[PDB]
Design a protein around this ligand. Structure first.
Ligand SMILES: Cn1ncc2ncnc(NCCc3cnc(NC(=O)Nc4cccc(C(F)(F)F)c4)s3)c21
Length: 255
């Protein structure tokens, strides 16, 4: 039954649309964690109070080294606080801006670690639906840790960039949506920008719908194959996580 007075609030770890993330310390144990501060008025305004309660429920069951822990939550009067595992090496979004693009060795490792986290998620029938660089964090030893199960549902906001055709059209969708997103991620890791980037929402809609993307000259055939086999309009055709993990290019470049 946590209260704010139990925690030493430290430095900001990031700013979000719904609230801010701060580094924190549990006064008794001296344990280092992260506290995301959400406003209650903001949550009730967009009608997502149930989604947050669903996220906490989903995260109370999941345990995996490539999934950022959510320990529980508390509120006072005006704000809601999420007790979170701290990811010392920040976001992948930030690492991507810092390095422009990743090499194949780093990319494959991230895809391998993501696939594992998704494999564990999909087996428990949990679909993430929001796989993007800003929702991927890096642990002490540089491992990928997936976070933000707010838009997660059971089997079967920002830009549209990572959302599959079935999701952007407002149709039915299963575990295969995390596979399209994984494909999109793999492309942005190597290229530096997502395959369907546009200056307008409406153009991005056209690109995703018709699956209109190209590869720059530096992308290898092994990466070209993987991404192409993932980015398919037909959800039931897309490669499985097991095939992704056993993919020649993935096996070659992964650690
Ligand atoms: C930036 N950063 N740098 C280091 C670092 N280390 C640990 N954590 C960080 N950041 C927080 C990561 C999150 C994990 N889970 C989240 N969950 C969430 O934000 N849920 C959520 C929010 C608003 C609205 C809704 C609702 F209701 F709409 F569903 C749901 S955010 C870190």
């Amino acid at each position: 039954q946590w209260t704010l007075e139990d925690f030493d609030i430290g430095r900001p770890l990031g700013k979000g649309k719904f609230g801010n993330v701060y580094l924190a310390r549990e006064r008794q144990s001296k344990f280092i964690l992260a506290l995301k501060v959400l406003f209650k008025t903001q949550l009730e305004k967009a009608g997502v109070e149930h989604q947050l309660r669903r996220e906490v429920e989903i995260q109370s069951h999941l345990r995996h080294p490539n999934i950022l822990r959510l320990y529980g939550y508390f509120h006072d009067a005006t704000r809601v606080y999420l007790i979170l595992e701290y990811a010392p090496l920040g976001t992948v979004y930030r690492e991507l801006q810092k390095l422009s693009r990743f090499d194949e060795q780093r990319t494959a490792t991230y895809i391998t670690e993501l696939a594992n986290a998704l494999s564990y998620c999909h087996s428990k029938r949990v679909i993430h639906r929001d796989i993007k660089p800003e929702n991927l964090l890096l642990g002490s030893n540089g491992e990928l840790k997936i976070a933000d199960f707010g838009w997660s549902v059971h089997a079967p906001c920002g830009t549209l960039d990572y959302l599959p055709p079935e999701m952007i059209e407002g149709r039915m969708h299963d575990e295969k949506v995390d596979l399209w997103s994984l494909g999109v991620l793999c492309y942005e890791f190597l290229v530096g920008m997502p395959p369907f980037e546009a200056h307008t929402y409406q153009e991005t809609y056209r690109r995703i719908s018709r699956v209109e993307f190209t590869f720059p000259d530096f992308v290898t055939e092994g990466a070209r194959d993987l991404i192409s086999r993932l980015l398919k309009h037909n959800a039931s055709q897309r490669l499985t996580l097991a095939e992704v993990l056993e993919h020649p290019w993935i096996k070659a470049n992964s650690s």
